[PDB]
């Protein structure tokens, strides 16, 4: 009767109306607070992704074998059941999974019988007895898993991750005020490439990250890094190009940055840095450097060494002096110096040919020079400023600038 009512309520035309796209460019069916899953949903065979939100007491029949085009499944706060042919087909076909476990049993135990699964989004919450979740440590049956994002209050990294380290590549964890401990389980990461830890309350960068020899990127988001003294072993991460240590508390930057020069992306926005050293800009391979909403007193001239830089953000600083050597670096595509204590925009600014973005918003300026026409890639949108600074171009320069 429940199946008959499910098929009667939702016609396929209503499902055509419900058809939409998602965050991964798949055909999504958003099903919200339903009594069950209709067979009319499975009658659609062009479907690429299923979204089931708080549809509990639901048993997946063999009829999902109709739709071969599935790649993503969103099983959100719903206790789902299974059938043998469904196990076989979703072992063969399903690869992307995004579940929310508001309740531990609202996580179903059958995610782990699959092998073709590649992406996993483990949003939700966890209790004190973290290691007892045998549901986590069954991903040994998963062979193709490559994306794992666990938004949960996880204090201890499970031995699950230790087992699945051979093929896993991306971590995204949001503890939200919960301290993360037991970092040997992240030490025995071997083939991992991406690590995004948010609010893990990691006081220091562990030797776990340096045990990783193939980490493409690292995120220490919302982690109270007061000092950075363990960078000496960061040279072992030759694949490390991204260091997004933003909203952090790094008070000063030492010489240890010379250990790794393969670093390319460097986000220290809202950091506690007071003065930059002479030793950041030695690593010329850096292209993507962020100091947004910091409080740097001034910029020393050694910035001239960073030629391959394409992004230099120091916005909302206390910087009163920009020396002309950053204007000498012409490969600097983005350069954000907004809301600093600077005085006058540089007249010889047209020398920067490849200057795509110059965020200098809220800076105390007086009059724009006429050489913005010499700048090939700077716009009013790019040079975001207060409007009384926009009104300053000569009339012929307005004629040449309204036509770019």
């Amino acid at each position: 009767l429940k199946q008959l009512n499910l098929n009667n309520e939702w016609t396929p035309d209503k499902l055509r109306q419900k058809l939409q796209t998602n965050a991964h460019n798949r055909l999504e069916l958003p099903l919200i607070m339903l009594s069950g899953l209709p067979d009319t949903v499975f009658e659609i065979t062009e479907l690429q992704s299923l979204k089931l939100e708080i549809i509990k007491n639901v048993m997946i029949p063999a009829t999902i074998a109709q739709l071969d085009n599935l790649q993503e499944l969103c099983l959100h706060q719903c206790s789902v059941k299974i059938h043998s042919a469904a196990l076989s087909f979703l072992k063969e076909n399903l690869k992307v999974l995004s579940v929310k476990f508001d309740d531990m049993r609202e996580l179903p135990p059958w995610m782990y019988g699959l092998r073709n699964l590649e992406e996993l989004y483990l949003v939700g919450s966890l209790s004190h007895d973290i290691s007892k979740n045998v549901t986590l440590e069954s991903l040994r049956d998963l062979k193709s898993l490559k994306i794992l994002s666990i938004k949960s209050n996880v204090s201890k990294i499970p031995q699950a991750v230790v087992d699945v380290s051979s093929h896993l590549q991306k971590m995204c964890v949001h503890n939200d005020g919960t301290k993360l401990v037991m970092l040997n389980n992240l030490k025995k990461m071997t083939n991992l490439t991406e690590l995004e830890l948010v609010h893990c309350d990691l006081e220091r960068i562990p030797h776990a990250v340096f045990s990783l020899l193939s980490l493409q990127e690292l995120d220490l988001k919302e982690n109270n890094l007061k000092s950075i003294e363990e960078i000496v072993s960061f040279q072992h991460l030759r694949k490390l190009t991204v260091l997004k240590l933003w909203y952090n508390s790094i008070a000063y930057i030492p010489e240890h940055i010379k250990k790794l020069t393969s670093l390319e992306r460097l986000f220290f926005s809202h950091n506690k840095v007071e003065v930059l050293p002479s030793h950041l800009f030695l690593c010329n391979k850096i292209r993507y450097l962020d100091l947004s909403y910091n409080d740097i007193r001034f910029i020393p001239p050694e910035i001239g060494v960073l030629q391959s830089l394409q992004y230099f953000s120091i916005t909302c600083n206390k910087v009163e002096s920009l020396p002309d050597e950053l204007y000498f670096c012409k490969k600097l595509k983005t350069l954000k110096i907004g809301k600093n204590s600077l005085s006058v925009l540089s007249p010889k600014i047209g020398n920067l040919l490849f200057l795509s973005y110059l965020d200098i918003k809220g800076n105390h300026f007086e009059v724009l020079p006429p050489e913005l026409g010499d700048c090939r890639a700077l716009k009013r949108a790019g040079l975001v400023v207060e409007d009384a600074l926009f009104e300053t171009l000569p009339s012929d320069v307005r004629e040449q600038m309204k036509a770019d």
Partner: protein, 407 residues
């Protein structure tokens, strides 16, 4: 009582707001578990497609003459009982008829008496004892037939369809993985224009495909052809401009396709092409090119030759860097570049003006260049990308894009 009750609760007004449109932009209405056709349905005069789907043994009344615009009927598991005046009205008006059935008795015998019928679609297995290609012997009465889709899992094309093929212009066969015994028996349908062998699992091209001279569009969808080797003989097909070889095990493209210079809509997607070669770009007439879900090593420079290219689709293929020769062409309109390993998008996209949509979600895209704002036709719906990467753009150009979007 059932008919009158069905007239009552399903009144004409809610049915009027029930009206919808198809891919042909024709007014439909889907009737789904109805006892019969309500008279309120037949009262409608603007109807174009009437969908009698799963209507149990409904008798069609003469009031179908009220459906003056009626041209399309899709009898999906719905045996239609009809009489002489409704028969005359359908013979003089109705022109397209997609009969889906699961039994020979479900197929009505009057559908072979319609004069003006030109599009006819069958779904359901047709191989049976003492009825193989005999029930459709009335197709000779139908002289206006131009489209004949047979999703019938048939093992061989019927000879009555071959005599029909003198006036048939379109023949699409769906066999669901069953090899159809060609034996070069399609040489009779010299009038055939669109041979779309869907899921035929041929694994080869018979000589009848390039023996007929009238095919413009030849889509061998899921024909499982390992090596695309019969393309040299397609140059005699001056009409051929759409050769969609998708859903196959083509592992390499031989250089010989450079013979076919007339191709425009070469859709070669969802395959294991290791690389499209430079000689593939020898067809400068190529306007629509689909290579999505493929194993390309990269995208070569001779793409600059294809000045007529509008939508190049290499989604979820293996392209690490975008060549500037891609941007040398200015006619690009729909760039399916998402889910790739594009390190960065060059600023030369600012040259593109015809680009009204570009798929940039996923990838290894470091940032979106400001030159994307230089494109006038591009908007937020056109520029599908992640929220943070979109936020990397300056605020005012994003405001410009927003204002051009909403209006």
């Amino acid at each position: 009582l059932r008919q009158l009750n069905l007239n009552n609760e399903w009144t004409l007004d809610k049915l009027r707001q029930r009206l919808t449109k198809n891919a042909q932009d024709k007014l439909e209405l889907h009737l789904f578990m109805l006892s019969g056709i309500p008279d309120t349905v037949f009262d409608l005069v603007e109807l174009e497609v009437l969908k009698l789907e799963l209507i149990p043994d409904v008798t069609i009344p003469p009031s179908i003459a009220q459906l003056t615009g009626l041209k399309e009927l899709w009898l999906y598991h719905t045996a239609a009982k009809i009489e002489a005046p409704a028969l005359a009205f359908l013979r003089e008006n109705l022109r397209a008829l997609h009969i889906k059935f699961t039994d020979i008795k479900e197929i009505p015998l009057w559908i072979y008496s319609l004069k003006t019928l030109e599009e006819l679609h069958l779904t359901g297995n047709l191989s049976a004892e003492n009825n193989r290609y005999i029930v459709i012997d009335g197709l000779r009465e139908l002289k206006r037939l131009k489209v004949l889709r047979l999703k019938s899992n048939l093992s061989k094309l019927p000879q009555v369809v071959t005599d029909v093929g003198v006036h048939l212009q379109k023949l699409s066969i769906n066999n669901e993985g069953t090899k159809l015994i060609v034996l070069n028996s399609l040489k009779k349908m010299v009038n055939l224009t669109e041979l779309e062998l869907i899921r035929c699992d041929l694994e080869r091209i018979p000589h009848s495909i390039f023996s007929l001279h009238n095919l413009q569009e030849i889509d061998l969808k899921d024909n499982n052809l390992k090596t695309i080797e019969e393309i040299i003989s397609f140059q005699h097909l001056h009409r051929l401009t759409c050769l969609k070889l998708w859903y196959n095990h083509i592992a390499y493209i031989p250089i010989q396709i450079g013979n076919l210079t007339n191709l425009e809509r070469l859709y070669l997607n969802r395959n294991k092409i290791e690389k499209i070669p430079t000689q593939l770009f020898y067809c400068r007439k190529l306007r629509y090119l689909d290579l999505s879900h493929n194993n390309l090593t990269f995208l070569p420079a001779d793409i600059g030759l294809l000045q007529n290219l509008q939508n190049l689709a290499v989604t979820a293929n293996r392209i690490e860097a975008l060549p500037p020769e891609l941007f040398q062409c200015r006619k690009l309109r729909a760039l399916h570049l998402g889910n790739n390993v594009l390190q960065s998008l060059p600023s030369r996209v600012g040259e593109l003006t015809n680009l009204t949509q570009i798929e940039l979600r996923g990838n290894r895209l470091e940032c979106l260049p400001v030159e994307l704002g230089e494109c006038p036709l591009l908007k937020r719906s056109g520029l599908v990308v992640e929220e943070d990467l979109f936020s990397t753009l300056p605020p005012e150009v994003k405001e410009r894009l927003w204002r051009a979007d909403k209006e």
